[PDB]
Amino acid sequence: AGRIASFLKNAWAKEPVLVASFAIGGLAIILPSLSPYTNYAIRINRATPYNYPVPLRDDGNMPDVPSHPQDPQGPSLEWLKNL
């Protein structure tokens, strides 16, 4: 804890470029695991409709599937408009 501080000071005095590079790399490595918006990015990626949604045949036993796009059932994007 005392020799490494001196090593850090010497590196800052001799190779500032390497100090900055290593700090940036470590931050980029560890920050994404501690961020709450990573799952938000995943959800945004999952919400982009690249292909056509093929409808399902009504067997009369799917209350959770809407019968029209404007019905209350199905997923919602209201979380995205507040972002």
């Binding site: 093929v54 409808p55 045949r57 029209h68 796009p69």
Partner: protein, 114 residues
């Protein structure tokens, strides 16, 4: 290995929707809200049969629903829709973002009339 069955040219005729891409893009959201049922029926037929020759009547029904939708739009909101799709058409990417006043006026017109 057998002959391929094909519909006759008479079976393939239908009243055609002859509006350009910008008009369709301008009216697309309301068209998908209003004509949802025949379109979903046609798409289900198309993805279940895996053969375009078995879902021709559904395509004709889709065409008729689109024609009814556009006839209503003509009967009630001609000028606002014309302004909106001209705005949409000017853009090289046909962007919704650059014409919001025209879209708002068209939306008000259709909400009040229909």
């Amino acid at each position: 290995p057998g002959i391929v069955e094909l519909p006759t040219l008479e079976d393939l005729k239908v009243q055609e929707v002859k509006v350009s891409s910008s008009v369709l893009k301008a009216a697309a959201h309301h068209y998908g809200a209003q004509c949802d049922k025949p379109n979903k029926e046609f798409m289900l037929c198309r993805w279940e049969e895996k053969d375009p020759r078995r879902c021709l009547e559904e395509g004709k029904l889709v065409n008729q629903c689109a024609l009814d939708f556009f006839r209503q739009i003509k009967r009630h909101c001609a000028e606002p829709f014309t302004e909106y799709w001209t705005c949409i058409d000017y853009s090289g990417l046909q962007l919704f973002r650059h014409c919001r006043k025209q879209q708002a006026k068209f939306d008000e017109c259709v909400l009040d009339k229909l």
